[PDB]
Amino acid sequence: NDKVYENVTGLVKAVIEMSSKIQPAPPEEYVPMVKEVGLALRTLLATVDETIPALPASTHREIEMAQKLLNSDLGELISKMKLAQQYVMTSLQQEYKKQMLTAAHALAVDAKNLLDVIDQARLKML
């Protein structure tokens, strides 16, 4: 349903458009890309926090679990990003540009999982 769905979509969109800009773009333009995805992530997390109290208390812990995973993913992304910033040598750059993409997408997939967890909790209200 919308609020949460809309912000999950915004995060996926952000991941797609950061992934599009990786290949062409230098390093000097890698933190900004990740910064944007991170800001899109924070908005989604705050949106889920606002939705938690209206869901059965027995679903909280799991929702939190899905929330923490995304933070871990963002950490893994920034981690790969550091490597692509430092090593501009082509062979190393192509490799780390690739690991950033893969890590960014892992985030989009867990964002979707968080969504599935919210819907599951909403259905528990039946």
PDB file of N, CA, C and O in Angstrom, residues 45-72:
ATOM      1  N   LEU A  45      13.195   4.340   5.735  1.00  0.00           N
ATOM      2  CA  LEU A  45      13.266   3.835   7.100  1.00  0.00           C
ATOM      3  C   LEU A  45      12.383   4.679   8.036  1.00  0.00           C
ATOM      4  O   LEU A  45      11.665   4.138   8.880  1.00  0.00           O
ATOM      5  N   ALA A  46      12.411   5.999   7.884  1.00  0.00           N
ATOM      6  CA  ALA A  46      11.574   6.849   8.733  1.00  0.00           C
ATOM      7  C   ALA A  46      10.098   6.581   8.427  1.00  0.00           C
ATOM      8  O   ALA A  46       9.262   6.599   9.322  1.00  0.00           O
ATOM      9  N   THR A  47       9.790   6.317   7.162  1.00  0.00           N
ATOM     10  CA  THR A  47       8.417   6.043   6.744  1.00  0.00           C
ATOM     11  C   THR A  47       7.904   4.731   7.341  1.00  0.00           C
ATOM     12  O   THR A  47       6.726   4.599   7.644  1.00  0.00           O
ATOM     13  N   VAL A  48       8.795   3.760   7.499  1.00  0.00           N
ATOM     14  CA  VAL A  48       8.422   2.480   8.081  1.00  0.00           C
ATOM     15  C   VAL A  48       8.256   2.650   9.599  1.00  0.00           C
ATOM     16  O   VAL A  48       7.371   2.050  10.197  1.00  0.00           O
ATOM     17  N   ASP A  49       9.110   3.460  10.219  1.00  0.00           N
ATOM     18  CA  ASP A  49       8.995   3.695  11.659  1.00  0.00           C
ATOM     19  C   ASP A  49       7.610   4.262  11.977  1.00  0.00           C
ATOM     20  O   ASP A  49       6.957   3.849  12.924  1.00  0.00           O
ATOM     21  N   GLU A  50       7.170   5.214  11.164  1.00  0.00           N
ATOM     22  CA  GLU A  50       5.874   5.855  11.355  1.00  0.00           C
ATOM     23  C   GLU A  50       4.720   4.860  11.173  1.00  0.00           C
ATOM     24  O   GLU A  50       3.630   5.048  11.718  1.00  0.00           O
ATOM     25  N   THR A  51       4.974   3.790  10.417  1.00  0.00           N
ATOM     26  CA  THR A  51       3.963   2.769  10.155  1.00  0.00           C
ATOM     27  C   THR A  51       3.953   1.636  11.188  1.00  0.00           C
ATOM     28  O   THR A  51       2.935   0.979  11.376  1.00  0.00           O
ATOM     29  N   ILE A  52       5.078   1.414  11.866  1.00  0.00           N
ATOM     30  CA  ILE A  52       5.176   0.336  12.851  1.00  0.00           C
ATOM     31  C   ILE A  52       4.094   0.293  13.948  1.00  0.00           C
ATOM     32  O   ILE A  52       3.430  -0.731  14.122  1.00  0.00           O
ATOM     33  N   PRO A  53       3.906   1.389  14.704  1.00  0.00           N
ATOM     34  CA  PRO A  53       2.882   1.371  15.759  1.00  0.00           C
ATOM     35  C   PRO A  53       1.471   0.922  15.359  1.00  0.00           C
ATOM     36  O   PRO A  53       0.709   0.445  16.202  1.00  0.00           O
ATOM     37  N   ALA A  54       1.124   1.066  14.082  1.00  0.00           N
ATOM     38  CA  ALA A  54      -0.196   0.662  13.599  1.00  0.00           C
ATOM     39  C   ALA A  54      -0.257  -0.805  13.163  1.00  0.00           C
ATOM     40  O   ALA A  54      -1.259  -1.252  12.626  1.00  0.00           O
ATOM     41  N   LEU A  55       0.816  -1.550  13.397  1.00  0.00           N
ATOM     42  CA  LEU A  55       0.870  -2.954  13.013  1.00  0.00           C
ATOM     43  C   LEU A  55       0.973  -3.827  14.260  1.00  0.00           C
ATOM     44  O   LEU A  55       1.527  -3.407  15.275  1.00  0.00           O
ATOM     45  N   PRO A  56       0.454  -5.063  14.194  1.00  0.00           N
ATOM     46  CA  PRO A  56       0.512  -5.958  15.351  1.00  0.00           C
ATOM     47  C   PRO A  56       1.920  -6.019  15.947  1.00  0.00           C
ATOM     48  O   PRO A  56       2.910  -6.193  15.251  1.00  0.00           O
ATOM     49  N   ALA A  57       1.928  -5.925  17.288  1.00  0.00           N
ATOM     50  CA  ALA A  57       3.217  -5.912  17.953  1.00  0.00           C
ATOM     51  C   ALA A  57       4.160  -7.098  17.744  1.00  0.00           C
ATOM     52  O   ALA A  57       5.361  -7.015  17.966  1.00  0.00           O
ATOM     53  N   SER A  58       3.538  -8.186  17.263  1.00  0.00           N
ATOM     54  CA  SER A  58       4.332  -9.385  17.071  1.00  0.00           C
ATOM     55  C   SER A  58       5.110  -9.386  15.739  1.00  0.00           C
ATOM     56  O   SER A  58       5.921 -10.262  15.462  1.00  0.00           O
ATOM     57  N   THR A  59       4.846  -8.364  14.930  1.00  0.00           N
ATOM     58  CA  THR A  59       5.509  -8.222  13.632  1.00  0.00           C
ATOM     59  C   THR A  59       6.657  -7.212  13.675  1.00  0.00           C
ATOM     60  O   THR A  59       7.460  -7.144  12.748  1.00  0.00           O
ATOM     61  N   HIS A  60       6.723  -6.443  14.758  1.00  0.00           N
ATOM     62  CA  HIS A  60       7.755  -5.418  14.943  1.00  0.00           C
ATOM     63  C   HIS A  60       9.191  -5.904  14.790  1.00  0.00           C
ATOM     64  O   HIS A  60       9.949  -5.388  13.964  1.00  0.00           O
ATOM     65  N   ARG A  61       9.561  -6.882  15.604  1.00  0.00           N
ATOM     66  CA  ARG A  61      10.901  -7.451  15.590  1.00  0.00           C
ATOM     67  C   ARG A  61      11.363  -7.856  14.182  1.00  0.00           C
ATOM     68  O   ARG A  61      12.503  -7.587  13.797  1.00  0.00           O
ATOM     69  N   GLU A  62      10.482  -8.494  13.414  1.00  0.00           N
ATOM     70  CA  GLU A  62      10.819  -8.921  12.057  1.00  0.00           C
ATOM     71  C   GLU A  62      11.007  -7.699  11.144  1.00  0.00           C
ATOM     72  O   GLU A  62      11.935  -7.649  10.342  1.00  0.00           O
ATOM     73  N   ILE A  63      10.114  -6.722  11.272  1.00  0.00           N
ATOM     74  CA  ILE A  63      10.186  -5.502  10.470  1.00  0.00           C
ATOM     75  C   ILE A  63      11.506  -4.797  10.762  1.00  0.00           C
ATOM     76  O   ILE A  63      12.174  -4.309   9.849  1.00  0.00           O
ATOM     77  N   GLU A  64      11.874  -4.754  12.039  1.00  0.00           N
ATOM     78  CA  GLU A  64      13.128  -4.142  12.472  1.00  0.00           C
ATOM     79  C   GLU A  64      14.281  -4.894  11.820  1.00  0.00           C
ATOM     80  O   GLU A  64      15.245  -4.289  11.361  1.00  0.00           O
ATOM     81  N   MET A  65      14.181  -6.222  11.806  1.00  0.00           N
ATOM     82  CA  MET A  65      15.208  -7.059  11.197  1.00  0.00           C
ATOM     83  C   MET A  65      15.410  -6.647   9.740  1.00  0.00           C
ATOM     84  O   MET A  65      16.534  -6.482   9.281  1.00  0.00           O
ATOM     85  N   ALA A  66      14.307  -6.499   9.015  1.00  0.00           N
ATOM     86  CA  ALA A  66      14.381  -6.101   7.620  1.00  0.00           C
ATOM     87  C   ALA A  66      14.947  -4.680   7.509  1.00  0.00           C
ATOM     88  O   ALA A  66      15.596  -4.348   6.531  1.00  0.00           O
ATOM     89  N   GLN A  67      14.717  -3.849   8.521  1.00  0.00           N
ATOM     90  CA  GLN A  67      15.238  -2.483   8.482  1.00  0.00           C
ATOM     91  C   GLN A  67      16.748  -2.452   8.648  1.00  0.00           C
ATOM     92  O   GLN A  67      17.436  -1.722   7.940  1.00  0.00           O
ATOM     93  N   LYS A  68      17.259  -3.256   9.573  1.00  0.00           N
ATOM     94  CA  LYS A  68      18.696  -3.307   9.850  1.00  0.00           C
ATOM     95  C   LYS A  68      19.493  -3.854   8.674  1.00  0.00           C
ATOM     96  O   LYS A  68      20.616  -3.424   8.425  1.00  0.00           O
ATOM     97  N   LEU A  69      18.907  -4.805   7.961  1.00  0.00           N
ATOM     98  CA  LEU A  69      19.549  -5.407   6.800  1.00  0.00           C
ATOM     99  C   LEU A  69      19.880  -4.338   5.765  1.00  0.00           C
ATOM    100  O   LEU A  69      20.971  -4.323   5.202  1.00  0.00           O
ATOM    101  N   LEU A  70      18.934  -3.434   5.523  1.00  0.00           N
ATOM    102  CA  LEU A  70      19.134  -2.357   4.555  1.00  0.00           C
ATOM    103  C   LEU A  70      20.290  -1.447   4.989  1.00  0.00           C
ATOM    104  O   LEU A  70      21.064  -0.986   4.152  1.00  0.00           O
ATOM    105  N   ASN A  71      20.403  -1.177   6.288  1.00  0.00           N
ATOM    106  CA  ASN A  71      21.519  -0.355   6.777  1.00  0.00           C
ATOM    107  C   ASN A  71      22.828  -1.105   6.506  1.00  0.00           C
ATOM    108  O   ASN A  71      23.808  -0.515   6.069  1.00  0.00           O
ATOM    109  N   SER A  72      22.836  -2.406   6.763  1.00  0.00           N
ATOM    110  CA  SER A  72      24.026  -3.208   6.508  1.00  0.00           C
ATOM    111  C   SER A  72      24.375  -3.140   5.020  1.00  0.00           C
ATOM    112  O   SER A  72      25.543  -2.987   4.668  1.00  0.00           O
TER     113      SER A  72
END
